[PDB]
């Protein structure tokens, strides 16, 4: 119920894909070469240009029968700008020293590229990833 | 033939009620209430009122077959909230939202001259 | 069916309430599925529909000869300048909750016809009616309370199926069904056999 | 019963599977009616003018 | 072939047929005359003795 | 009564209409298409007769057809186009819709899946409401030829514990497919479940296409004017080549191929090139036309159609066949009286340049009858040949049954197999596998 | 360069029932043929004196309409007097599965 | 490679990792003499002709040859514990359900 | 009881009588509605 | 002679989907014609649900015959027998 | 304040208003019951003393049974299933005659106007034939020749469109909302271009036109619905949406008093 | 013709060998021919190929030839489906044909034949012969109106009236 | 015979007209579009529905009976 990965991508190409409400960004973190994430986004909902720094985070907290807030008072880690619910479903090993993890956000396809630092990771079912522009 | 009885859509049989409410297993404080010889006019509606509460969960409407004149509404709302006080309120609001709407078409008609 | 060699039977039958209005309120009186059109090839129905609204908008009878000199991209044109969508898309709306339909739907007038086949005398039951004197078997036809019959595929796919009792009740008991005496070492049914 | 009065009959069985007297020849053109003819056994046989 | 590989039966229906969303994929409709035309010999019981009383 | 599965045991329910009504899926196996059809219901009068249909001919045991040993019953073309609609990756549905959706199942366990989209406002995914009619602990992993982890095109299909993780749905898919998604839940869930999954799957998507709405039309056949244009200038090279061809024939400056006469030869390579040309065409056809294209995406959804048909739809119609060869000459030397003696071109040999938006000329129209009177004549008589084949397959076959000691014999008692299919395997069951053994070099096997 | 004869009209190559279909080009011929053979089964005004006609069995549409696309021959064969069938507002679409 | 089969392995493994939780990182249980010998004992439960005589067991041997080579091809030592990481448990309750599929994949008699 | 086709003129005639019109040759001899109260309904 | 001993029986010990069938079918025949139940019913009338539970239950009596095709039978009784579905 | 209704346009028989502040399930409920839900006066019973036309008895019952009647009174008159009587009594039903017959050489036409009404009305202006010709003579029904005699009773209940669309007192409720694209509830079907393939809808002038500037709005919700309410006669188009409304409220309060009584 | 064979490597590769084809059925005498591989030499007609080779050649010919029409199409047939095919037309001697001069020919029960195409002729037969049936076929007991021994009809349900004394 | 009392798709009474159509049809001699428009008739289902109609009620009457 924590953040386990957290790094600012720059996209260097946004490639729609034919698909005119979700589109694929490719990105590499701005402090670690070797980090990649690739990422498919709804730009009707979150727009994202080439060249564009975002910060990205996972998180673990926020059966379980999804509820509307409610009320303005609850309160969570909603401090970004498009936040989206997927699995992890495949890790695989590159080079023996790169690990890239798989996530299905609805459909949407994630690959995340890195370092073993990324072991936090868990093929688990609860996984949020969020987005700040 | 066999044709349905055109009047038995909107009539309620013999020895039926208008509404039958029972509880359902699947979610805690869900309810299912049946309603008899009625439409999408009313289920969408009430529906629609329904999920503008923010205590209100889950209300969704099913109707099972063209032929008969009947559909099913699945209420869900948080503990302690009775799902017929929900229904109730929401039907309440249905009735005042109606009321203004015609208090308003009448005034308007009337201000104009044709 | 229509005058393309489309021929469809009424699945359900819906009221104007329910059945989807386009953006003038009209709510069409058939709904056909689009996947009539492709396998069967059938490019002259949405022409001869096409044609018909321009001529309904227009109100002079249109011209449906085969090697009629007019397009499909001159009927189009003159859609568009009746004020409706070229290719004869119109918006339409979902009568349940009102909501627009995702995808535009292809509208307009088209003739069709009601062919003699009806199900009120293409319908049949039987339960123990009269039966044929020769075979004391169920009779031939409806209009005679006739019964159906068992062919000999449906009898080897029950046989393929296993289902032995069900053949047996069938052809010795939904059928017609005699019991015969036969001696033990004759085995002949000319057998006398006074019952009282 | 336009059709039916401007009818053509072939005496060839309607039986056998020899499709070729079925098929309509070139010279139908102008003739006979390339498109109405009945389905199934009677389909090449029966011809409209 | 006419009489004993397939011959007529009494207990039997024919019609057409129409698509049906609404049902599920081992469930038939079925015509009200066709249901009350065709009958099936259930034989009394004391588990549905009531039930077949109020048939009758 | 074609085949076994033509006669099922079902479920009476009773209904204010005088017509039957059966599931979309069970039209398949009865080759039924509301056309008019008419079927036949039979009532069992007995408790044997009622067990024996419930427990050995039953639709959910039919479900897979020992013909092909995979599921002859499948999704039906309009709900198959509607899931394939629904699963795109673009595909977002409201609180409201998917509410509804999620009632609509009626074995839905009660927790709302979770939105793939939550800060922007709650949004399901199609393939996540989808996912709940499948049941739990199904897997499923299909890579098509140019899938991958990351499929920009969101081909092939991964499904992990009953939760599809990408790819579209199509005929492949869910469809009869023998490692499609309906064997793999007969196989390990059971009948029940597999009717269960079907039912549900065709209210969702019937749900979502009435609240979301499907059409075709005439634009959809229509190509904007470049590829009318390149596909007229494919048509025209094509009969240039035609006529050059001719042309060196009758200089007598082609080898015709050994053994086949000349004429032979040379109409085998014009058919050739004419079929080469209308391919050529239904690709450019097929390149032009959008992912919004109703046609295009309804052969997309593998529902119907084909590339014949959007090519003579919207390309070319193509060469016209009467007994395996283009049209003779009828009358002496010409095929028809408008042409003169010894035409050999395309257009007098039943070669149609004019798809069906466009029209065809009075010649390509009779050509078009011809061949159609052609394939009417050769559908009504293999009917019966076929008909008559079966008849006698079925009284040859008619006594060989398995006994108890897994071994096929006729009523004589001659064994005509040892064991069954020389494995003793039921043919529902077999599925087709791959062996890793056959396959691989040493060093890969090796290691 | 001779055509020492040509065409009246090549649509006159259809026959009765063909020529009551609306662009047959447009169509597939066994479409066309399909067409023919299911026209003769159309129920519609067959005669004018119908009350007098005691026939063993007729077929009456309540009310006739002539189609909005008329192929030019089909006033030859008087079908707009006579029409067998009506104009109903079509739309190609899949609304409730049914 | 891609033939006719009566059970699907790949599936049984898949099933069997996914409810057992298989995890790459803990190191297998399984041991190379208890994989030979559950094959071999799984090899050997498979029966689809029953008959105490040589002719018998011939033909039954005979009959599973084609399903012995995929059991082998499959349930190797290196893929058990190199492409696969099943537990002892997991591998138990795969065979176990491999043997139940098998034997309900048999030709039913009286089958037409 | 019966009425002429071309003369439509009521004949009333009994058992054991020509069925020819008086008035006329013709002898459709048609045969006039029931008395009996007849209801129709739009539906 | 034909009838082979109790043990030394080559036919599968498993249940037929075809014998399951055909038992189900004669336990609710003889249970509607009033015949004994062996298994307690909980507020069920349906004599397919109660030869369901009985199989189930392994509380049937009948017997299976297998027979070969030469003519020797092999007796099985429902209680040994396994049932896969 | 609530909903509030911007009447565009009215007319005898055409009024074109906009609904603001009103969710798009309530409107569609409201057109629904406006289509359906609103009681109206039209033949149901026709009975045949003398009937020797050309056409048929069922037939010309059944264009009998299309024929507009007055309903301003509706609500005044009682179901015949509801009140205790024979058979059409006074107090639930409307007794018109129809009495015609040709002559020498002029065909008869049998229109609206022919029809008389036999019962009494109690002074309500219920039942009347609805006539907007021009002419003035109504809707044609049928035509006698020479010996053709009609001579047929009327009996018109209440009722409403559900049970057969005779009873129908709107012809057409065209509804529309979002003209621009701003909810991308349709994506327009475009070969060259979307913009120029679809012509802008009439509304379209009462909105701001999209600015491809600003993304796009996914807290939208529809809103602003323009409907236009034409009336086949019977009864004005103000007064067949106030009684739509009104028939869409007494059917919340049955369900709240089922619900209470429950 | 390109052939899998198998690659030094171990992985089956493409050898694009030449393969002649002839119009005429002369097996007896082509097959001597030398230069040629007579080992993998196939013919169209199974008849030839039974002549020439032997009884399971013509039955693995036949069946090759019947899974080449059925897969000409696309359809797909299960192989045991083909197999028990091709060995009730050669469970005999020769080659069975599936016609009235083939298994209708055979000595099984004489109502079996009798609902095939001859239907009289049979009937005559047996009586001059004197045939007994078993009536353990399907059509016998479907003309009797009795069960036939299939699938549920195969066995017979009985008794036991020890075991229903304990489950009491 | 006679033209429908109601439209079929909408429900437009249209009977009322059709005298009116025939006249506008032959005392003014103006084109059938124009006559519809002058009518009233907006949606093209009434307009077909007047358009296509026959009149067989006067060929009917053509007889004696
Ligand atoms: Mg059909
Ligand atoms: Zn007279
Ligand atoms: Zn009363
Ligand atoms: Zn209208």
């Not at chain 1, 070797?34 to 994202?48: A, G, H, M, R, S």
């Not at chain 3, 059938?42 to 009629?68: M, Q, R, Y």
């Not at chain 6, 044997?48 to 999704?75: D, F, H, Y």
């Not at chain 6, 040949?385 to 014999?409: F, P, S």
């Amino acid at each position: 119920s924590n953040t386990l990965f957290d790094d600012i991508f720059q996209v260097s190409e946004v490639d729609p894909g034919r698909y005119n409400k979700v589109c694929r960004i490719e990105a590499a973190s701005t402090t670690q070469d070797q980090c990649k994430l690739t990422l498919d986004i709804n730009v009707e909902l979150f727009p994202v240009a080439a060249q564009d720094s975002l910060t990205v985070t996972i998180a673990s907290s926020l059966t379980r029968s999804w509820r509307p807030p409610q009320a303005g008072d609850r309160s969570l880690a909603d401090d970004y700008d498009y936040v989206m619910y997927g699995t992890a479903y495949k890790f695989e090993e590159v080079s023996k020293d790169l690990i890239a993890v798989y996530y299905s956000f609805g459909g949407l396809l994630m690959r995340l590229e890195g370092n073993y630092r990324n072991l936090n990771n868990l093929k688990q079912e609860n996984a949020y990833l969020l987005i700040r522009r | 033939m066999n044709a349905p009885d055109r009047f038995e859509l909107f009539l309620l049989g013999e020895g039926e009620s208008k509404l039958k409410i029972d509880p359902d297993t699947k979610a805690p404080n869900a309810v299912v209430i049946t309603f008899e010889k009625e439409d999408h006019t009313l289920g969408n509606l009430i529906r629609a009122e329904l999920l503008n509460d923010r205590k209100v969960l889950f209300a969704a409407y099913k109707v099972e077959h063209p032929f008969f004149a009947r559909f099913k509404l699945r209420i869900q709302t948080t503990e302690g909230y009775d799902p017929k006080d929900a229904l109730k309120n929401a039907c309440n609001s249905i009735i005042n939202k109606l009321g203004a709407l015609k208090t308003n078409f009448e005034t308007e008609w009337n201000l104009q001259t044709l | 069916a229509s005058r393309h060699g489309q021929k469809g039977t009424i699945g359900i039958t819906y009221r104007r309430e329910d059945m989807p209005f386009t953006a003038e309120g009209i709510v069409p009186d058939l709904i056909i599925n689009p996947h009539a059109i492709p396998s069967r090839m059938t490019v002259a129905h949405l022409i001869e529909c096409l044609l018909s609204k321009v001529a309904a908008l227009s109100g002079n009878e249109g011209d449906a000869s085969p090697f009629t000199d007019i397009t499909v991209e001159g009927i189009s044109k003159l859609l568009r300048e009746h004020g409706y969508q070229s290719r004869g898309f119109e918006v339409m709306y979902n009568g349940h909750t009102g909501k627009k339909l995702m995808a535009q739907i292809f509208f307009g007038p088209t003739y069709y016809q009601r062919l003699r086949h009806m199900v009120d005398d293409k319908i049949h039951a039987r339960a123990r009616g009269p039966m044929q004197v020769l075979t004391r078997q169920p009779v031939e036809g409806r209009s005679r309370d006739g019964g159906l019959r068992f062919g000999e595929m449906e009898r080897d796919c029950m046989i393929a199926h296993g289902a032995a009792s069900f053949l047996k009740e069938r052809l010795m008991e939904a059928s017609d069904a005699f019991r015969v005496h036969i001696c033990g070492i004759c085995g002949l049914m000319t057998v006398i056999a006074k019952l009282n | 019963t336009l059709s039916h009065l401007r009818r053509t009959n072939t005496p060839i069985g309607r039986d056998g599977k020899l499709a070729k007297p079925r098929q309509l020849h070139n010279t139908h053109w102008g003739l006979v009616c390339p498109a109405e003819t009945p389905e199934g056994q009677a389909c090449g046989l029966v011809k409209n003018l | 072939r006419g009489n004993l590989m397939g011959k007529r039966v009494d207990f039997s229906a024919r019609t057409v047929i129409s698509g049906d969303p609404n049902l599920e994929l081992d469930q038939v409709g079925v015509p009200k005359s066709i249901a009350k035309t065709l009958t099936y010999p259930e034989v009394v019981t004391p588990y549905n003795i009531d039930r077949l009383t109020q048939l009758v | 009564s074609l085949h076994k599965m033509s006669m099922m045991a079902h479920r009476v329910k009773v209904i204010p209409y005088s017509t039957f009504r059966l599931n979309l899926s069970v039209t398949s196996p009865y080759n039924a298409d509301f056309d008019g059809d008419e079927m036949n219901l039979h009532v069992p009068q007995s408790e044997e007769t009622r067990a024996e249909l419930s427990q050995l001919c039953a639709v959910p045991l039919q479900i897979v057809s020992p013909q092909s040993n995979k599921p002859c019953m499948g999704i039906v073309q309009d709900t198959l186009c509607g899931i394939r609609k629904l699963t795109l990756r673009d595909t977002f549905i409201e609180l409201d819709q998917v509410l509804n959706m999620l009632y609509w199942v009626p074995d839905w366990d009660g927790v709302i899946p979770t939105p793939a989209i939550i800060k922007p406002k709650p949004l399901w995914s199609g393939k996540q409401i989808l996912s709940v009619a499948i049941p739990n602990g199904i897997h499923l992993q299909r890579f098509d030829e140019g899938t991958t982890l990351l499929s920009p095109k969101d081909n092939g299909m991964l499904i992990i514990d009953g939760q599809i993780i990408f790819g579209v749905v199509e005929k492949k898919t869910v469809g009869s497919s023998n490692g499609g998604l309906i064997h793999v839940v007969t196989r390990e869930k059971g009948p029940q479940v597999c009717a269960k999954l079907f039912g549900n799957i065709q209210k969702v998507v019937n749900f979502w296409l009435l609240h979301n709405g499907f059409s075709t039309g005439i634009g959809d056949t229509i190509a904007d004017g470049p590829t009318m244009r390149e596909i007229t200038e494919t048509i025209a090279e094509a009969k240039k080549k035609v006529l050059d061809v001719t042309k060196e024939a009758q200089a007598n400056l082609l080898t015709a191929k050994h053994g086949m006469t000349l004429r032979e030869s040379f109409e085998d390579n014009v058919v050739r090139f004419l079929n080469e040309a209308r391919d050529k065409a239904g690709r450019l056809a097929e390149v032009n036309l959008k992912d919004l294209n109703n046609v295009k995406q309804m052969v997309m959804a593998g529902s119907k159609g084909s590339f014949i048909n959007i090519a003579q739809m919207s390309a070319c119609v193509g060469q016209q066949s009467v007994e395996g060869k283009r049209i003779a000459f009828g009358f002496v030397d010409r095929t028809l009286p408008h042409f003169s003696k010894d035409d050999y071109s395309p257009e007098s040999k039943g070669f149609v340049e004019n798809s069906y938006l466009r029209g065809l000329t009075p010649q390509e129209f009779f050509f078009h009858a011809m061949g159609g009177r052609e394939g009417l004549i050769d559908t009504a008589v293999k009917t019966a040949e076929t008909g008559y084949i079966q008849r006698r397959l079925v009284k040859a076959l008619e006594d060989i049954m398995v006994h108890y000691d897994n071994t096929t014999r006729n009523s004589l008692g001659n064994v005509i197999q040892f064991i069954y299919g020389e494995d003793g395997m039921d043919a529902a069951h077999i599925e087709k596998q791959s062996l890793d053994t056959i396959g691989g070099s040493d060093a890969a096997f090796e290691k | 360069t001779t055509f020492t004869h040509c065409e009246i009209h090549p649509s006159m190559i259809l026959g009765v029932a063909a020529s009551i279909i609306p662009f047959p080009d447009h169509n597939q011929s066994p479409r066309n043929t399909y067409q023919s053979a299911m026209g003769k089964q159309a129920m519609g005004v067959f005669l004018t004196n119908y009350n007098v006609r005691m026939d063993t069995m007729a077929n009456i549409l309540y009310y006739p309409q002539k189609p909005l696309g008329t192929t030019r021959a089909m006033e030859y064969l008087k079908f707009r007097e006579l029409p067998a069938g009506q104009n109903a507002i079509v739309a190609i679409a899949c609304y409730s599965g049914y | 490679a891609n033939w006719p089969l009566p059970v699907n392995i790949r599936r049984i493994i898949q099933n069997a990792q996914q409810t057992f939780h298989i995890d790459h990182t803990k190191p297998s249980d399984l041991t190379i003499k208890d994989i030979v010998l559950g094959v071999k004992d799984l090899q050997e439960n498979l029966l689809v002709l029953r008959g105490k005589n040589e002719i018998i067991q011939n033909a039954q041997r005979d009959a599973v040859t084609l399903f012995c080579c995929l059991l082998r091809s499959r349930l190797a030592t290196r893929r058990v514990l190199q492409e696969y990481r099943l537990t002892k448990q997991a591998f138990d309750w795969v065979l176990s359900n491999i043997e139940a599929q098998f034997l309900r994949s048999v030709v039913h008699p009286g089958e037409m | 009881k019966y009425i002429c086709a071309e003369c439509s003129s009521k004949l009333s005639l009994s058992r054991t009588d020509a069925v020819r019109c008086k008035d006329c040759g013709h002898r459709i001899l048609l045969k006039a509605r029931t008395k009996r109260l007849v209801q129709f309904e739009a539906r | 002679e034909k009838a082979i001993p109790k043990d030394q029986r080559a036919t599968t010990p498993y249940m037929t989907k075809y014998e399951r069938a055909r038992i189900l079918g004669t336990r609710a025949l003889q249970i509607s014609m009033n015949a004994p139940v062996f298994v307690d019913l909980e507020g069920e009338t349906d004599p397919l649900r109660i030869a369901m539970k009985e199989l189930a239950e392994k509380k049937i009596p009948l017997v299976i015959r297998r027979y070969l095709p030469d003519g020797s039978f092999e007796d099985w009784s429902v209680e040994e027998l396994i049932v896969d579905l | 304040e609530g909903p509030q209704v911007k009447i565009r346009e009215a007319s005898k028989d055409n009024v074109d208003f906009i609904l603001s502040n009103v969710d798009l399930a309530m409107a569609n409920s409201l057109r629904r019951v406006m289509i359906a839900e609103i009681p109206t006066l039209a033949i149901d019973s026709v009975e045949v003393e003398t009937n020797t036309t050309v056409l048929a008895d069922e037939f010309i019952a059944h264009r009998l049974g299309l024929i507009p009647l007055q309903s301003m009174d509706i609500e005044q008159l009682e179901y015949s299933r509801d009140c205790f009587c024979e058979d059409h009594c006074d107090k639930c039903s409307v007794v018109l005659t129809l009495q015609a017959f040709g002559e020498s050489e002029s065909t008869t036409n049998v229109y609206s106007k022919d029809l008389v009404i036999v019962s009494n009305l109690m002074g309500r202006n219920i039942g009347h034939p609805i006539i907007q010709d021009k002419e003035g003579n109504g809707v044609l029904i049928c035509k006698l020749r020479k010996g053709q005699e009609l001579k047929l009773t009327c009996v018109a209940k209440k009722g409403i469109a559900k049970e057969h669309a005779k009873w129908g007192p709107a012809a057409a409720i065209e509804f529309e909302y979002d003209p621009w694209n701003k909810l991308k509830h349709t994506d327009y079907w475009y070969e060259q271009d979307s913009a120029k393939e679809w012509p802008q809808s009439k509304n379209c002038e009462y909105e701001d036109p999209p600015n491809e500037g600003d993304p796009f709005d996914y807290k939208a919700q529809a809103d602003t619905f323009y409907m236009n309410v034409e009336s086949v006669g019977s009864i004005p188009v103000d007064q067949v949406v106030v009684r739509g409304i009104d028939t869409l409220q007494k059917k919340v309060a049955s369900i709240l008093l089922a619900l209470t009584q429950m | 013709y390109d052939r899998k064979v198998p690659s030094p490597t171990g992985e089956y590769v493409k050898e694009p060998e030449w393969v002649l084809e002839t119009d005429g059925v002369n097996l007896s005498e082509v097959m001597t021919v030398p230069g040629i591989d007579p080992t993998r030499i196939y013919t169209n007609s199974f008849i030839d190929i039974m002549e020439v080779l032997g009884i399971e050649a013509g039955r693995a010919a036949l069946y090759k030839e019947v899974y080449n029409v059925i897969a000409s199409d696309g359809s797909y047939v299960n192989y045991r489906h083909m197999a028990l095919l091709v060995d009730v037309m050669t469970t005999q001697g020769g080659l069975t044909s599936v016609t009235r001069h083939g298994f209708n020919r055979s000595n099984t029960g004489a109502l079996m034949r009798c609902s095939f195409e001859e239907t009289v002729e049979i009937l005559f037969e047996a009586g001059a012969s004197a045939e007994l049936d078993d009536c353990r076929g399907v059509s016998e007991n479907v003309i009797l109106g009795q069960m036939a021994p299939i699938g549920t009809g195969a066995f017979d349900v009985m008794i036991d009236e020890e075991s229903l004394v304990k489950y009491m | 015979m006679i033209v429908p009392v109601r439209c079929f798709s909408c429900g437009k009474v249209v009977g009322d007209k059709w005298e009116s159509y025939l006249n506008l049809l032959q005392e003014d001699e103006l084109d059938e579009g124009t006559a519809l428009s002058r009518l009233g008739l907006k949606r093209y289902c009434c307009r077909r529905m007047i358009l296509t109609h026959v009149d067989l009620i006067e060929k009917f009457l053509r007889y004696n009976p």
